[PDB]
Design a protein around this ligand. Structure first.
Ligand SMILES: Nc1ncnc2c1ncn2[C@@H]1O[C@H](COP(=O)(O)OP(=O)(O)OP(=O)(O)O)[C@@H](O)[C@H]1O
Ligand SMILES: Nc1ncnc2c1ncn2[C@@H]1O[C@H](COP(=O)(O)OP(=O)(O)OP(=O)(O)O)[C@@H](O)[C@H]1O
Ligand SMILES: Nc1ncnc2c1ncn2[C@@H]1O[C@H](COP(=O)(O)OP(=O)(O)OP(=O)(O)O)[C@@H](O)[C@H]1O
Ligand SMILES: *[C@@H]1O[C@H](CO)[C@@H](O)[C@H](O)[C@H]1NC(C)=O
Ligand SMILES: *[C@@H]1O[C@H](CO)[C@@H](O)[C@H](O)[C@H]1NC(C)=O
Ligand SMILES: *[C@@H]1O[C@H](CO)[C@@H](O)[C@H](O)[C@H]1NC(C)=O
Ligand SMILES: *[C@@H]1O[C@H](CO)[C@@H](O)[C@H](O)[C@H]1NC(C)=O
Ligand SMILES: *[C@@H]1O[C@H](CO)[C@@H](O)[C@H](O)[C@H]1NC(C)=O
Ligand SMILES: *[C@@H]1O[C@H](CO)[C@@H](O)[C@H](O)[C@H]1NC(C)=O
Ligand SMILES: *[C@@H]1O[C@H](CO)[C@@H](O)[C@H](O)[C@H]1NC(C)=O
Ligand SMILES: *[C@@H]1O[C@H](CO)[C@@H](O)[C@H](O)[C@H]1NC(C)=O
Ligand SMILES: *[C@@H]1O[C@H](CO)[C@@H](O)[C@H](O)[C@H]1NC(C)=O
Ligand SMILES: [Ca+2]
Ligand SMILES: [Ca+2]
Ligand SMILES: [Mg+2]
Ligand SMILES: [Mg+2]
Ligand SMILES: [Mg+2]
Lengths: 330, 330, 330
């Protein structure tokens, strides 16, 4: 039948056009993918002043709210903290959430199995006017995290400037690229803010804009901390000029249930010596966690991948033809 | 022939059952796999008190033995250290391991090529009553690391509590998951310890339990140092409910030959100003290295992967039947 | 025809030799591959004395130029810094790059929108004899970055010794290997220096050698900063003995356009209490960024990969071999 032959030739032309176009153009068959070596260098620039009751104006600069100072990809930006200054290793009443005692016989000398707050001496001392806690030996007085100020202390850190410097290089092709491209110049970085449509190549990111693009409100996040994931994609074609290689930034919001362990927090201490007595300042920082992930590939024309793709296409063509013949003969 | 037809039908039925089951159900071909964005947040609640010979009791809390304060996945838990306090830059005898001099003419002014402890002045000063070392200009007193206490100073850190907060999200499917599952509640995290059979979902990990599950003794690993690798496999299936998706924790141990470079150690110093003189406290911490690596895949039904798997199965069936027929023909 | 059959037999034996040798040996089809768990431990031994103008001799050791104290794959080695001592919060003039004012009416009370150095009170104070800058509320004095010392301060850090301790383990094969191979002994590491041909197994890496092998000059990387990427490869075959497994160290140079943001730099502060007043020392460190990336796989004989390769070879032989029949027809 002529119609059977027409259908066979149509299927043959379809599969041939497919194997000659799709894998070659969309899948980049004539090209070869290769990994890159990425080193993330982040740099912020902003000032936040937090005024607390009983303490003077606290000045916080880039070195203060950015705890990883060596330029690590994973860094935390301080937004809310609880200040517990002038801690000494001495006897004090333990935190009330650890345990409540009504008499000295209730306390047991030793160390707590879970949430150890100090070396219990077996004495029940009054923590305050109402409740009493077992005396412990440790840094004192114990930090009380119970109260969380609803307004963020470092609320000025919402619209800060975040500069991410990423340099990637492909060892196979020996091509080194950086986030700073030929389109971006010195005067451009001085007056640009990152945007998905307006300024896609501007390396200066706004913290509030980054948090809002991920799908999270900055105020509720900074109130108790959080995690924001930033990804940089370096998908490009080496067949064109190096100016076409431009990094693409995607922001992903990492959030969980607020009923169980809401936000992200941690504690750090600054050890100093004053009046011959070693003292420290403990801060429970509720800050946003920023993680930079870089994943990209580069493809250039090569003989061996092209030949392998041609062979695979010829094989698929033959398989399709023999299968069509088998289906037609029934 | 009837037997040849029976054999061919058996072969085609076998390969059909194969392409139906093994490709779809076993390999999840109809589903679509994507990567996740992982962020690691770790917390340790526990106190360790170390009393040195001739020194007062020293209190070490979460801010002390956890050196990464921001909460990086790679963190070291202090278990044994050597304290050399009151170091100020000065001209003094070098460590005897660097060099031994019998007269002043042996020392040469300059800097050592390898393991340089200071700028040699060219004078041979007695380090102690027996041996003499060349005078250098560096921090003094030179830390002597030869004597490591067999009993671990922070031996109480074996049965501490480690909480790992892992939040992963898939961008293509827009699904966010956290290590805290619906099965785990607030009262469950109060009193639970992670176990391979009893409590697999309890986010509270015991350091000694993690070390013993990897195959290492905590005492020997703490007295000299070591590395423990923790991996979180987020096997997630979007076809079912999100409650069935669950994280799986695997504990691995990284160890080497004890004769060459036993354990893991590092050196850090705390700079302070006392009596108008810049002084520091150097510590050679022998701590266990913990690394968190999260890798997971999610699968959701989709039309295009299903069609591709059906086409691949049809092709495999066709090729197999043709091959079988060729073999039968012989 | 005889020649047609000869050509057919030749093509068949060629594709048979291909499917029996290439996928088996060149691709290691019978072997199975899996990921490893790697932890990077770096430790440097070197001392450099920087005699800054106006200050006494400053001694720098491993606890000084290595900013990651615990130890991470990404670490910075200090080569040049700008010291601003005795910083205290107060009301002082700002930098001229932020803003220049000729009268008190020019300054506006509030905080700068971009590159906010300090809270501007609103009064124009003379920064020096020539120019005047708006008075701010921040750390006093202000760091100046217009003058960069051309001679490297830590120029002695060029030929320091870098030791990398990497422990890899394959959970699929339960084999643990370390960079310290059996060929390397204790006395070997005392005098060896890493080289591409001379000492490939020596774990003592020279900083200048690493910088020069990547393709970058150490002088520019010390003056303005730089980034160097080091990759460790663990490609090995488990069919042989474990002594044949040797780590491969490759150095990559990550550089960008010197006209826009040359090198890598950061700022960190050391908080201390002197005379009852909180003070700090801010350093703009121009250091080289070293990133360690470990990627490797191990191969061991197994029955299932061998059977899959046999089936794939049979399939290819069937497909390719039946193919060209339309061509026999001519
Ligand atoms: N966080 C940021 N906010 C705004 N602009 C930035 C930020 N980081 C870098 N830039 C801009 O990028 C350019 C290149 O930065 P570079 O690496 O030279 O920093 P730098 O000039 O050494 O830092 P400093 O200005 O403290 O000396 C600078 O001109 C600067 O204006
Ligand atoms: N290392 C740990 N050991 C035991 N329990 C922990 C640990 N980390 C967290 N938890 C428990 O998990 C719950 C949620 O933790 P969350 O993130 O709220 O810490 P937190 O309450 O801010 O810390 P803190 O209790 O020190 O203020 C808490 O109720 C706490 O009891
Ligand atoms: N950065 C380095 N430069 C030169 N030699 C090193 C370096 N790191 C380690 N080594 C050598 O490797 C051997 C094993 O090192 P090990 O892990 O015992 O360090 P360590 O002796 O604890 O450190 P320290 O010498 O500071 O006490 C040592 O004999 C040392 O000479
Ligand atoms: C004493 O401390 C406890 C701790 O929970 C608190 O509930 C109580 O209100 C305090 N009492 C006073 C008078 O401050
Ligand atoms: C938002 O950005 C502006 C800069 O134009 C700044 O003045 C303002 O303080 C920012 N908002 C907050 C809440 O910090
Ligand atoms: C700076 O970069 C921008 C990119 O948006 C470009 O439009 C502009 O022309 C550049 N300026 C100069 C002076 O080249
Ligand atoms: C002096 O120091 C050396 C260092 O190796 C030691 O061997 C020796 O015993 C010491 N002598 C005394 C008397 O302490
Ligand atoms: C083991 O855990 C218990 C808690 O039940 C604790 O009291 C004990 O000190 C731990 N052991 C060590 C060696 O720390
Ligand atoms: C807490 O979680 C555990 C999970 O093991 C569950 O058995 C228990 O019922 C939960 N408690 C409440 C009050 O829901
Ligand atoms: C004052 O500071 C400015 C800062 O740019 C500088 O250019 C100028 O030379 C300085 N004047 C004197 C007299 O130091
Ligand atoms: C180069 O290495 C030698 C060691 O033989 C050392 O003496 C010299 O100071 C090094 N060069 C620099 C610039 O540090
Ligand atoms: C030390 O290791 C080197 C490796 O190059 C080897 O040649 C030498 O024989 C070893 N020394 C001893 C005493 O085994
Ligand atoms: Ca101090
Ligand atoms: Ca890291
Ligand atoms: Mg609490
Ligand atoms: Mg030693
Ligand atoms: Mg500047």
């Amino acid at each position: 039948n002529k119609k059977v032959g027409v259908i066979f030739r149509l299927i043959q032309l379809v599969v041939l056009v497919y194997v000659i176009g799709w894998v070659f153009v969309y899948e980049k068959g004539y090209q070869t993918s290769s990994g890159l070596i990425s080193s993330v260098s982040v740099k912020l620039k902003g000032l936040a002043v937090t005024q607390l009751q009983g303490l003077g104006p606290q000045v916080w600069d880039v070195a203060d709210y950015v705890f990883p100072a060596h330029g690590d990809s994973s860094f935390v930006v301080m937004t809310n903290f609880i200040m517990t200054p002038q801690q000494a290793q001495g006897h004090c009443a333990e935190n009330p959430e650890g345990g409540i005692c009504q008499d000295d016989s209730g306390c047991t000398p030793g160390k707590a199995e879970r949430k150890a707050q100090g070396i219990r001496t077996g004495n029940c001392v009054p923590f305050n006017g109402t409740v009493k806690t077992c005396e412990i030996f440790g840094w004192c007085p114990v930090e009380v995290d119970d109260k969380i100020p609803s307004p963020a202390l470092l609320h000025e850190a919402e619209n800060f400037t975040l500069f991410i410097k990423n340099s990637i290089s492909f060892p196979r092709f020996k091509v080194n690229r950086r986030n700073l491209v030929e389109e971006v110049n010195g005067t451009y970085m001085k007056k640009c803010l990152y945007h998905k449509i307006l300024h896609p190549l501007c390396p200066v990111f706004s913290l509030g804009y980054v948090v809002r693009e991920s799908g999270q409100d900055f105020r509720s996040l900074a109130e108790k901390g959080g995690v924001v994931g930033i990804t940089i994609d370096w998908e490009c074609d080496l067949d064109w000029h190096v100016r076409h290689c431009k990094p693409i930034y995607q922001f992903h919001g990492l959030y969980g249930e607020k009923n169980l362990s809401p936000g992200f927090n941690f504690r750090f201490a600054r050890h100093f010596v004053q009046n011959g007595t070693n003292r420290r300042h403990l801060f429970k920082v509720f800050g946003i966690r920023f993680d930079i992930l870089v994943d990209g590939k580069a493809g250039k024309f090569d003989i061996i991948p092209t030949m392998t793709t041609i062979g695979s296409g010829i094989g698929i063509f033959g398989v399709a033809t023999v299968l069509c013949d088998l289906l037609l003969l029934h």
